Design a protein around this ligand. Structure first.
Ligand SMILES: [Mn+2]
Ligand SMILES: [Mn+2]
Ligand code: NA
Ligand code: NA
Lengths: 361, 360
């Protein structure tokens, strides 16, 4: 699609909603309550908090906002049914009324891993809708998002250029004596000043796989510093990670870096259309074992990227394999090699094309 | 032990909280608890760690689960000694399941919270893998402890409040026509982080929004309202504050809404006192707004606790919890919504025996 407004033409989101409603019909689901932010953005075209969206299998959807907010939300979204409330009580009562008016018998809810997929709404809904069967629809919503359209890809391309600007800042400022938090602060600002509305920055000077920065951990001489960025454009993310060597690396760091380099070459060469992800995992594990790094292997070399930094295909808490498919957007390699000196990481966002992987970051 | 506190708290603080928490489990016949909210994880282990995964038996030593390579690093940060490393998130779930089954637990506590990582996916799998186990919500237990602050917690919040002030001063200095919400938020965020806050949250609205995360494409106009909300942390404890900035000349509706908010703050501070239920004060504020022609601008929820979360119990709700000394409350949390913006004036207060002490 060409000549899209700065946030996408409203037709994009109408079509996604229509395809979502057909998917509900195919599974005999009468309606869906969408309370995850990422799927709310996917279907309405805008970020709004808290995300509260009711989608009947047939008919017009409804969005619930706080009194006073309808005018800006309607300026941003194609959705016309907007209900304002003054108390969170009225919201559940509003959902209950649309449940009754539509005669729904099976209602979808996303058992997801993001705001606002929390436990209390699910429990209250069951008590207040006793005749209704709640069905998890995360397979549906993530199923639609796994293959990107051309506008989504263009958004991720822009986010990847922003990630690069943030990583350039990181490389320029990292030096002995800075704290993880001071480094993250400058990266964050640079990302936000280039238009990212919800960036996430990790900076580690110790081995941590999810390294939100600390104020009192400082860069040392002859060390490594690992920076991870997930940053957005039009709410679509790009993910990238770099390991910086400060001064002279010791023998264990150099060996771990050489192994990570060779593992990346394997992952990129073997990730192609039609390959099951676990086929590549097996190869990466076997490679770590041949090099005396069997105990250092972590599963999950890649994940999808989109309206979430991490989205399927990804490791979760096993039925059928997931095969690489064209127009997936994948982050490679996501896992660190953990040594006492730090989390050795080199990560980029790639578009899966028919015959190759195109690096976007 | 010594009353001089190390920069991130003495480890005795958290060991005593764990002991008290285990007694509460025993008292309610709870065999064990799975703690997966970051805020209670910090409360009991003394350290932030991602992802937060803590298992607490009613009797015995707790266990923390981390990724292979992190155990030595976690033990330097925490009093906890039982640390289990995993290589696959699948193995994590199985490890928690093994501890439950080996101990014969029949009732297991989980926080039905509204923060990471209390998501629906873990709950769904946990019930499936533990069909004979009854899951009980223990948010009332953990917040029963957390809503009454100790003296070190109060000091952390005082420190967070001074940081929030520094961020609000940056906001006041930079807001001018032509800046976007995101550009304003960016400078505030940096100032908070450069003063030591590790997880700040900044809202900037140029249109009326209650949860005003900034947009890149909403800009400050001449003769307009800009509302800034800060939640910023010290030692993971938050302070909350909000100010309404007028750019140029405020029109009559804005000035009137500000005067009405001033009078509402006066009621909230006079009536929020030890022994009073929060809903009693909420009702008084609702009646006040209705008598002053602002019923259509009113939102429920005038206050909330503050601590390891920006917003935590106690809060006015529908269903009682009475205001008590050493609670920390944010007042007034709700904006008065008018077309020009979210009219907000919010500060963090310590509940004293006879008054509220403003910390921000
Ligand atoms: Mn990643
Ligand atoms: Mn608040
Ligand atoms: Na519209
Ligand atoms: Na220790």
């Amino acid at each position: 699609l060409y000549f899209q407004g700065t946030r996408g033409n409203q037709k994009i989101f109408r079509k996604r909603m229509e395809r979502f409603q057909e998917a509900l019909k195919e599974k005999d689901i009468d309606a869906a309550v969408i309370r995850t932010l990422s799927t709310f953005i996917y279907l309405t075209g805008t970020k709004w908090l808290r995300p509260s969206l009711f989608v009947p299998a047939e008919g017009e959807p409804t969005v619930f906002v706080v009194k006073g907010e309808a005018e800006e939300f309607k300026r941003r979204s194609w959705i016309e049914n907007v209900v304002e409330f003054q108390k969170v009580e009225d919201l559940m009562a509003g959902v209950v009324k649309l449940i009754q008016s539509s005669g729904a018998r099976r209602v979808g809810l996303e058992f997801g891993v993001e705001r606002d997929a929390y436990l209390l709404f699910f429990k209250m809904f069951q008590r207040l809708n006793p005749t209704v069967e709640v069905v998890d629809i995360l397979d549906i919503t993530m199923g639609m998002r796994m293959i990107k359209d051309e506008w989504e890809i263009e958004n991720i391309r822009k986010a990847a250029k922003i990630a690069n600007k943030g990583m350039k800042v990181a490389e320029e400022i990292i030096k002995p004596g800075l704290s993880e938090l001071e480094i993250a602060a400058e990266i964050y600002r640079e990302l936000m000043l280039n238009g990212s509305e919800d960036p996430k920055v990790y900076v580690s000077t110790t081995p941590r796989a999810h390294a939100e920065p600390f104020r009192d951990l400082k860069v040392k001489e002859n060390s490594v510093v690992t920076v991870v960025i997930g940053t957005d454009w039009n709410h679509y993310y790009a993910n990238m990670a770099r390991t910086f060597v400060v001064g002279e690396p010791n023998e264990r760091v150099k060996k771990a870096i050489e192994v990570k380099e060779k593992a990346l070459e394997i992952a990129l060469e073997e990730t192609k259309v039609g390959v099951p992800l676990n086929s590549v995992e097996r190869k990466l594990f076997q490679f770590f074992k041949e090099n005396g790094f069997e105990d250092s292997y972590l599963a999950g070399y890649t994940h999808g990227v989109g309206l979430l930094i991490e989205e399927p295909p990804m490791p979760t808490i096993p039925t059928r394999a997931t095969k690489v498919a064209e127009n997936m957007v994948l982050s490679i390699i996501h896992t660190p090699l953990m040594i006492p000196e730090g989390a050795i990481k080199h990560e980029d966002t790639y578009l899966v094309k028919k015959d190759e992987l195109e690096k976007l970051t």
